[PDB]
Design a protein around this ligand. Structure first.
Ligand SMILES: *[C@@](O)(CCC(=O)O)[C@@H](C)N
Ligand SMILES: *[C@@](O)(CCC(=O)O)[C@@H](C)N
Ligand SMILES: *[C@@](O)(CCC(=O)O)[C@@H](C)N
Ligand SMILES: *[C@@](O)(CCC(=O)O)[C@@H](C)N
Ligand SMILES: [Zn+2]
Ligand SMILES: [Zn+2]
Ligand SMILES: [Zn+2]
Lengths: 340, 147, 340, 340
């Protein structure tokens, strides 16, 4: 007969015994270095220039493009359940709005500044963040102003972006979040705010480590921000580029960033850990991007995972890796779940 | 009897299984049990069997409990029973426990380490790259991640 | 009888046992922190101003000086086997070309810019690096512009070098690699590229740690770059000068270097290890120099070592010490060997 | 006309200027963190069991196999010129001496103990180091005692090696240098010396980082130590194995090593730099091995380098990388050169 063999063993070494720390549900909470709370949540809003818009974005489940006259009814139950912050994206659909220099980016009649004004009046306690970039406003769809050869013009781009950021601040945004990745734009935006007497009021939340890759699919359908001729791989960081990311984090801190965003999130958790050392004195924010979010939904609907469960797992993952803030399309679900 | 794991009897049984696989010809043994101190016992086992100089010990040092093992439970028909794996698999928030587990398994004889799952635990790979800088680090792209 | 004595021993300590990690051929691969691949290879080309040149360089085995009308037939099998990058050196032999300010360094009719133009057209996927210096173009053979007392004039040298580098970039080089070692030249080259709207397109690969010594013998016969009155020991680093090397690495990083070269290679592996910490976020490149290469051939032909074997040993040595790139005269051999 | 272009430059930054530190011959000495002196030199001796031997070793230039009755005349001019230390290797050529357990390794009639006795009497101020291994004494040529399957038996090997080391110490060696690389042998040798009341008198100089590779060619002809069936790659470290080397250094320190050797030397300078941190409180020794030495001679005779020059360059390289001791076949040349 084959029988169960047991080797002769030595007495347990105290150094081997970890189990005393996680044998009860409360202990698995004690073991967290940071717990998820409501105020860590930042919810994106896609504001249409059709004020009566409330259009579902196919590829981004449960998320709509919304006009200003639909915003009160949408935000009311969210703020009531504890929402503290939103990040605005403009989606102007009126024709002849987009041009090579992203003129409409800071149009006082455009959806972002209209959205700032509405929110400041109707939800005066909500903290408003605005994405700062030109890609939703350029005819070529790229994030900066281009030379003739289709490459980005750094100087003209950062000049245009500094203006957009300051103008959002002038209109009432509390926070500007430059997502363009163009070399040195944080310096120029910070100087811009200083010259406008707004730097002591305006948090600069840099997307310091934003990577190029396959996880932005459905975003390109909600904000109608698709490039044109070439790719984003010359300013967005290459996925293998840890050294570039570490240098970008150091740079943006140096140039005035009050906080930093790592994007995407789950697939870049090691870069959050890198940022937690490089940017240890600053808030670090995870951006759970469109492709990551849609991936979770796809897997959940296929029976691979449980949506709430894997929501909690991934979002606790951000906190473990060093983030203390989360931009996420699941904020409405969490405002309910964190009650329970 | 109370359905909790018996450490001493478990590591004794696991050391035997590992040595017997090595005896049969495996080049490498990869203990996935997460039970406290099993690497020490497996390494001593191999030493006593004159196989430690031939057998790579690839510890699953940082293996987390969670929602990503669904389809594995259908390919290897390895489903628990009464209770969960959360008392030996690490809690997903447990970075401190993971760092201590990495240090422990290195100390106890691991030639290499596995972090599992992978994508959702990339920060723990980065932690391991410092703690276990002189050892090979292995990522396990698990069933739920793949699916 | 003298008999074999065996001392009484204690049971094996687990801490003593390393052998489980390297007892199989695959494990000796697992133990490498970086494996050699084709794309890490950079092959030097010595371009003649006689367009029909294909002259073997005596002291540098299997390496020729080549004119442009011979380049297609030479590069074709190499690119076909996976060559990704070349580094160009100009060897103008027409008389009355060399002068005290290295005027011909950026002659649009000279071999480097002619070689850039040819390569950009015939091998549009090849990544082109150009050595930047004046020594192959000066009548005195030194790397910079000189004062009357034969010492290098820093200001005039860096001004001239910045121009040469920008002009190579203007002509099409993807990468400029300043090999002059003159204090502060990286700053001036980077500013030059910025002013020319080329810094976002041009990798700056500094020879940051280039040492004076006995290993450049045969180079002086392939590029006809011999000094004159004095030696290179006042700008090339002294071989014992670790402190100077560490400061040079930090300096060039600060001044804009995208990557760094350590030269020579094998005899300076400790400096690669130093650079891997100081320049941890940048690519580090090893230059397997003429004397090192010829030394390997000499020893192999004498039966001391096996050429392929010691090729692999030395080049894996670079990777172990922290390099991720290699400039080597054995690139053609490796493009075959890495297949096997 | 193509004219020499000079870009507009900014005033020199003080941070760019390194040149003030190395513009004079004395400064290039000031820049060394460690200068080469005579007492750092350790010269290998290959002692024959034919007492009248003085046989040149073909592949190892200017080096002989020597019997005891030839040692006085050979060592006299060397000690007179400042030689402080030797490392002994036994080459027994009498038939029927080698056996599977290396019985003759510590034969009181064998060349090592005869050489210790002679040196202790005729050169009482010379510091004597003995290589400790079994490979020059085993019939299979491997460094330890083997299982039947030709693999090394750790326990029996370390037991045999501890005995050999203690017996050399008993005979008069000041220092034992275990070159076997078998897991845990330093612990056993140290315990051996402790039990023999010799640990307070006996320096343990571990070959802690000894790599497998192509640089031991001519050694295999001077000490007639060739393996048999299989290779040394299961105990000697793989050339890519930095992690294993770092762990071996830490291990041997822990187990009692008073000093450590890195071998080979030039091709492993990065590992010397690693050892200088891990083993910062211990003497580090470079072993300029047979293949490295013969490589220098081959290149020098081919005109690639100058022998004295490249001797100084490579040996200063060891000191730069952190060694303070050198085992070298060029010790006789240096005892003359360091005068000049
Ligand atoms: C980002 O790439 C979009 C986020 C997403 O895809 O969900 C920039 C445009 N903020
Ligand atoms: C692991 O949890 C299974 C891997 C997978 O789910 O793919 C252990 C059982 N090796
Ligand atoms: C270098 O010193 C030459 C390389 C070699 O000798 O092979 C400079 C001139 N790039
Ligand atoms: C070493 O490998 C030999 C040195 C040399 O080859 O010169 C051991 C046997 N000490
Ligand atoms: Zn954009
Ligand atoms: Zn030069
Ligand atoms: Zn040996």
């Amino acid at each position: 007969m084959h029988t169960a063999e047991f080797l002769e063993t030595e007495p347990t070494e105290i150094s081997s015994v970890l189990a005393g720390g996680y044998n009860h549900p409360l202990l698995r909470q004690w073991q967290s270095e940071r717990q998820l709370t409501k105020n860590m949540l930042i919810f994106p809003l896609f504001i249409s220039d059709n004020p009566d818009d409330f259009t579902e974005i196919d590829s981004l489940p449960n998320i709509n493009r919304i006009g200003v006259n639909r915003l009160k009814d949408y935000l009311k139950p969210l703020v009531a359940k504890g929402l503290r912050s939103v990040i605005l994206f403009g989606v102007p659909l009126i024709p002849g709005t987009k041009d090579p220099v992203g003129t409409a980016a800071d149009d006082p009649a455009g959806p972002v500044i209209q959205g700032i004004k509405f929110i400041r009046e109707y939800f005066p306690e909500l903290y408003i963040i605005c994405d700062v970039c030109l890609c939703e406003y350029t005819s070529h769809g790229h994030c900066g102003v281009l030379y003739d050869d289709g490459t980005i013009n750094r100087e003209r781009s950062v000049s245009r972006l500094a203006a957009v950021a300051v103008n959002y601040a002038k209109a009432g945004a509390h926070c500007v979040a430059p997502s363009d990745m163009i070399d040195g734009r944080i310096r120029d935006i910070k100087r811009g705010l200083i010259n406008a007497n707004l730097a002591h009021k305006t948090f600069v939340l840099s997307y310091a480590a934003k990577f190029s890759g396959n996880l932005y699919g459905p975003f390109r359908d909600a904000a109608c921000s698709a490039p044109s001729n070439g790719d984003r791989k010359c300013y967005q960081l290459p996925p293998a580029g840890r050294g570039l990311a570490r240098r970008a984090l150091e740079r943006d801190m140096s140039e005035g960033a009050d906080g930093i965003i790592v994007k995407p999130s789950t697939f870049y958790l090691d870069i959050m850990r890198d940022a937690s050392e490089i940017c240890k004195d600053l808030p670090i924010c995870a951006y759970h991007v469109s492709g990551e979010y849609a991936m979770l939904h796809a897997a959940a609907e296929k029976g691979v995972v449980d949506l709430k469960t894997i929501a909690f797992e991934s979002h606790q993952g951000f906190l473990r890796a060093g983030a203390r803030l989360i931009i996420t399309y699941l904020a409405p679900e969490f405002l309910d779940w964190l009650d329970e």
